[PDB]
């Protein structure tokens, strides 16, 4: 007979399933090769289900690094009905088939939310690394044609809406992976894996010679042609097997006696596929690069510096057996540089549209399903499971000025005094790397020739009502006492030491990175910061290189060798979570010393759960490029949808084109602006406009200097515009800090793609170049040089108002909108209630005694004004105040609600001026606008407008 035919309180091994206190474990009845043997549904909350699966006959159940203990027990029922076993909470029903182990999720009325690949979507393949064992796992779900996906972290290919798309999940300077996706069907999936993972296609890309017949410039099969024109000397022409010069090993395949700086290289020929469909390409690049395929400019010019390269993707339909031309034009722009092109063969759209996860190494499959009423409610599930985001200190919501690098104490203090003397508001100033004696990275001591009195410096920063952040890497020179403390305990990764790697500083120094996965190493790492930096009064920690970035431009295999073994297992298994571990070290470290003082970290990598450690990510060493500016909009919106609500970027870009440096040097010498310097000023103007509406507003990068008065002088349009937006950030502070309060109290998200608030309007699904800043402002950056307008789509809504003029704009249409040099297009949603305060030089310079409450009429609205002490965790004990406000359009009524809570230093009495904007009343933004004066003492008042 068949395989099935042959094989209340009895042992569970006799039963198809076993119910425990919070879960059901089902034994797969029709076992397949590579398939699951056990599938568990564990109830974590009313809307929260933990799915586990394994090929073994028991679960390994390792402790999660990302999921925290939950607050309450959750009631649920289980029903077995033939092959179907269903776990039901008040809000969701999760079902599994005993036959296959396939899972699906419905709402309380049985409406489908998410279904596993029909017949099962889980595959297990054994893997062994360094005597440890686990599985490579695939999990695939069905996905309808109208499903849209957001999240995965922060990637640099300008992709937006991951439906039908691919992404590799590893960590590298500018690329932050978070294994969490949110759907427009109002659920999220969190994959609990720490290894290299993939969303979409589970395979690596292929070199061009593996998937195409190649013909060179003369038509000879078997290669492309490479033509190398050096800056000086004879041109070299050779055949190329493959275009793959992507890491330190493979750049040795470029021509041996041909200097790349100032060279112009052309790769060309024809490619011929053996199957028909959409081929998906990936370009890896540094220097200047363009790509043409079939005579189309598929990659218009991009640039990176020779040493932080990037990836960019494109796709094209190709016909089997037809030759099409391919040309890559490349200016390496350095002695070392990178260029590679790879591709994936076509995947049937029925399969490519599915939601597919691949994970290189875990002990079992673990994922979390979270349902919601809307996308904010999905994010709330993520915050329940991986921890709430604390309210950032209020000062973190102001302007941050940084540099790579302030070289001396005088330089740093001079920059800060420069803001105060010009009445350009600012809260935070940042000291970068190499403030230590050159040969002593990791000593945490200051070079006293350049910083003669570090404590006096921090005291002076504080006396000017500013806050200081300092750079701290996980990197230690081998000669330092601090290195030796880690090393003697086995807590330093050895590969970089064994291989005698030298860094880039001076003559080159030997170094290593500490193992953040070891809990005692974390304590020591914090203790060294506590003994050397904390007594100076430093307020914030810039935790750079937390990928960990042990060695730039190394291949996957060697990156794994460089960052393990770890305390928990191999680096193959524990590959992506370093920044989470490193952030725990500092957050739990500092609250251990002083539990009331707020913590701030800014870190270069990230992972699921990062937000629970009061830690933001910045988007890393990006270029001074319009295309990089555009990519940060989509990167930021995906990062926000990954559950982590504090994020920032280097306004202006980090690595600088040589022509911009030359422009600045010319300005310094002659006060004349060349064409490149004109572009520098416009790039920075537009990028500051954009940055004023991201969660943390921060300028940073390499030379030129980035203080606004260095970019352009007083009176120049660039200076005028940037100062306008820096001031506006502070007039918006009552609104902005209310959003910060909401991150903790309401599990809120600050920088929001349009799909969050306008999910019902599918025209927003692919829009990754506009966004909402809190509930009320729609921001549409200009990201092309010379443009004085741009196309904007206005979501379906009762209406929109131009912020600057108050002029009405209908919802549900796309049009060309004016965007002068000095202005970013900025609209306000009908129903907005927005509190604006007076000019201040820094957060809480003065109490917000007089607030203008702007009411943008035409729809109902709500807003809660949140205030607290700003600098400590007293809000956790109920020391804060909320003033809820509600506006009813039908009766034109505003209620300023009874104040809830109090705290030390709170205004008991204050003033509101209520200002209306409506379709018949185009009121420009104006602090002095005419309105209704309200003297408020905490008691409810009602206004009929
Ligand atoms: Ni020490």
Residue numbers in the entry: 1 to 7, 17 to 954
Reported in the publication:
In this context, we recently reported the characterization of a novel xyloglucan utilization locus (XyGUL) that confers Bacteroides ovatus, and species harbouring syntenic XyGULs, with the ability to utilize this abundant vegetable polysaccharide across sampled human populations. Here, we present the three-dimensional structures of BoGH31, BoGH43A, BoGH43B and BoGH3B, expanding our knowledge of the structural determinants required for xyloglucan degradation. Our analyses highlight key adaptations in these enzymes that confer their specificity for xyloglucan oligosaccharides, while also providing a rationale for the maintenance of two divergent genes coding for GH3 enzymes, and similarly two divergent genes for GH43 family members, within the same PUL. While we were unable to determine a structure for BoGH3A, our structural and sequence analysis of BoGH3B has also allowed us to highlight further potential differences between these two enzymes encoded by the operon. Together with existing biochemical data, our analyses of the three-dimensional structures, and various enzyme-inhibitor complexes, of BoGH31, BoGH43A, BoGH43B and BoGH3B provide molecular-level insight into the stepwise breakdown of xyloglucan by the BoXyGUL.
Within XyGULs, GH31 α-xylosidases play an essential role removing xylose from the non-reducing end of processed xyloglucan oligosaccharides. Indeed, deletion of the gene encoding GH31 from the XyGUL completely abrogates the ability of B. ovatus to grow on XyG and XyGOs. Consistent with this role, the GH31 α-xylosidase present within the Bo XyGUL (BoGH31) has been shown to be highly active against native XyGO substrates (XXXG and XLLG, nomenclature according to), rather than disaccharide-configured activity probes, such as Xyl-α-PNP, despite the presence of optimized chemical leaving groups requiring little protonic assistance from the enzyme. Crystals of BoGH31 were obtained by hanging drop vapour diffusion (19°C) using 0.2 M potassium thiocyanate, 14–20% (w/v) PEG-3350 as mother liquor and were used for subsequent structure determination. However, by far the closest structural match to BoGH31 was CjXyl31A (Z score = 33.1, with RMSD = 1.15 Å across 888 matched Cα positions). As observed for CjXyl31A, BoGH31 presents with an extensive, modular structure featuring several accessory domains appended to a well-conserved TIM barrel-like structure (for a full description of terms and domain nomenclature see). The catalytic core of BoGH31 is composed of residues 384 to 758, which form the central (β/α)8 (TIM) barrel fold and harbour the active site (discussed below). The domains decorating the central catalytic unit include an N-terminal β-sandwich domain formed by residues 16 to 213 with additional strands contributed by residues 363 to 383 when the peptide chain returns from a PA14 domain (residues 214 to 362).
